[PDB]
Design a protein around this ligand. Sequence first.
Ligand SMILES: Nc1nc2c(ncn2[C@@H]2O[C@H](COP(=O)(O)OP(=O)(O)NP(=O)(O)O)[C@@H](O)[C@H]2O)c(=O)[nH]1
Ligand SMILES: [Mg+2]
Ligand SMILES: [Mg+2]
Length: 327
Amino acid sequence: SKARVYADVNVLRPKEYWDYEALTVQWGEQDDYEVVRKVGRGKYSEVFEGINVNNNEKCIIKILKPVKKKKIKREIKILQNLCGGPNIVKLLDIVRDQHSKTPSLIFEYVNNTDFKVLYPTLTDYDIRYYIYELLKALDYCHSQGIMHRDVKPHNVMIDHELRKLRLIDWGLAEFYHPGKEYNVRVASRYFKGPELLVDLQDYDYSLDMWSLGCMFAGMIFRKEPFFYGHDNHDQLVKIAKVLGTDGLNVYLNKYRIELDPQLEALVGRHSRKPWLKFMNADNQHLVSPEAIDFLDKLLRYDHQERLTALEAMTHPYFQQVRAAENS
Ligand SMILES: Nc1nc2c(ncn2[C@@H]2O[C@H](COP(=O)(O)OP(=O)(O)NP(=O)(O)O)[C@@H](O)[C@H]2O)c(=O)[nH]1
Ligand SMILES: [Mg+2]
Ligand SMILES: [Mg+2]
């Protein structure tokens, strides 16, 4: 398997572009940024709203926990490669505490509204608009040779009043190299694509398109997360009871993957459930034909058939968003 688009970006760019391990951090001043209040965390980070002491602008201070320095230089190299990209979080500075050498990443600040509270308030148009803005970021990172590998609502900051969106958290992101087998231990369980769940390691930018489809399904069907499994095996069973197991067996067969036998037993045999079955009167005003047609082309087992980010932006579902952008 190979990406259908932007497959040679790394292949043909100079080695320093993707050789993040040869990166040399020009450390900033740790005292320029002061913590104001905690806004998030993760297994390997503690995230704070900060303040730039020199100019009084808000910032994000992402203090890393001890991790191999390959993981810290990748993410910094990726952020440097994408800086300036549409809707791509801006990396402003990188600092260390002298005594422990604990690195902090400094980013712009987004006045975000938690997605579990913001999403349910979104009009039909807002959903169209925010996914379109998120699509810009994804087409731009893919075109620069990078897979995000962690598309999900926690990683999409939205200032609703400013209608600004930024794709944040490049901590799992990677350089796409044709043929490379990657670890499938990426993305959050609910947003993990079938390829990660059935061990197809030579995945590409289309893993982000499945994750985007998962976010979109959740927003139009008002069901977060849309595919709610308790562990990977179960994450695949949840997918199989929606998409059907016939599609799954075509996919497995095409790529020549045999399921772990018990996983196989667990998956069973399920009929494809049409998309309108999730329609209910709360989500009614969001689940039109174009929405289903768009969603249906993102949630395909075959990562090769999913729309590219560039194609999705031109889908008729986003026509009104595009016309507004033209003014
Ligand atoms: N208000 C606000 N909150 C933010 C901002 N940036 C990050 N956060 C909060 O901090 C959280 C975690 O930071 P993130 O960069 O995603 O996390 P990570 O530490 O690498 N974690 P993970 O890999 O699990 O997603 C975000 O999910 C978000 O809720 C921001 O710019 N503004
Ligand atoms: Mg995150
Ligand atoms: Mg992360």
